Amino acid sequence: GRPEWIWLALGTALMGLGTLYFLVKGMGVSDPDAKKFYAITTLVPAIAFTMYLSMLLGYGLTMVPFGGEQNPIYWARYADWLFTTPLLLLDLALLVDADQGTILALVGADGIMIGTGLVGALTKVYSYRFVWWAISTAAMLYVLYVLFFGFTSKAESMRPEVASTFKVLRNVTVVLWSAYPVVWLIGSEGAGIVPLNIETLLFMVLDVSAKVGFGLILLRSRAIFG
Numbered sequence: 001g002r003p004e005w006i007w008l009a010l011g012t013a014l015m016g017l018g019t020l021y022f023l024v025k026g027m028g029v030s031d032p033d034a035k036k037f038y039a040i041t042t043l044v045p046a047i048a049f050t051m052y053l054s055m056l057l058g059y060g061l062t063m064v065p066f067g068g069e070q071n072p073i074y075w076a077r078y079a080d081w082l083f084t085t086p087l088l089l090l091d092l093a094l095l096v097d098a099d100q101g102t103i104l105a106l107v108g109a110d111g112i113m114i115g116t117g118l119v120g121a122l123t124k125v126y127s128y129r130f131v132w133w134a135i136s137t138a139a140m141l142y143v144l145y146v147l148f149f150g151f152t153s154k155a156e157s158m159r160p161e162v163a164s165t166f167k168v169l170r171n172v173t174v175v176l177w178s179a180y181p182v183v184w185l186i187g188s189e190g191a192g193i194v195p196l197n198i199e200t201l202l203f204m205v206l207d208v209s210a211k212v213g214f215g216l217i218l219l220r221s222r223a224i225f226g
């Protein structure tokens, strides 16, 4: 009965409720273009719900020795993020009619981000954990650069309503995503300053905002309609 369980429980509830709501709304829509955004966006909190639930029930946690101690590491987070982060990026790419090659590069970079983050999280030599963290953060910054510079450029060719919706979601994404490496650095996976219970809270707030919040903004907009 780990003290972070309460945030895993609340996370499970919020992702579950978000999923159900998006599913109800999405099943009701008949516009083909809107249905695509609903499918992608409903899947995001659906995956997160399954991983939060698994963690709540005591799975996706392993002990990694570093710094002379046995450290608890929630590896299930990375299984969630491996699939949900590219899905969020795909929502943004569809909104701005991004090029196929841009999408492949973004999804590639995002995979490197999550994959190297996981390797870092599991690494037994303390200093090397941070090498992997740095690589992961570089991949993240590539993603954010492309969203901020590249996608905004593409968005300029869309109707103002679509461009406006994209900018809100872009802004939400940059603010929330940029916090993740800092939480990792100061938390259980990194410097061990912020205790696991508080870190779980922080990741829960970030995750729910980045998936359910993002989804609410996108799915209530006229931008998703063809």
Ligand SMILES: *C/C=C(C)/C=C/C=C(C)/C=C/C1=C(C)CCCC1(C)C
Residues within 6 Å of the ligand: 081, 084, 085, 088, 113, 114, 117, 118, 133, 136, 137, 140, 177, 178, 180, 181, 184, 207, 210, 211
């Ligand atoms: C729904 C979940 C979202 C939007 C998660 C985003 C997660 C990141 C942007 C994670 C980035 C990381 C780094 C930049 C380096 C350290 C470890 C990673 C996975 C946390």
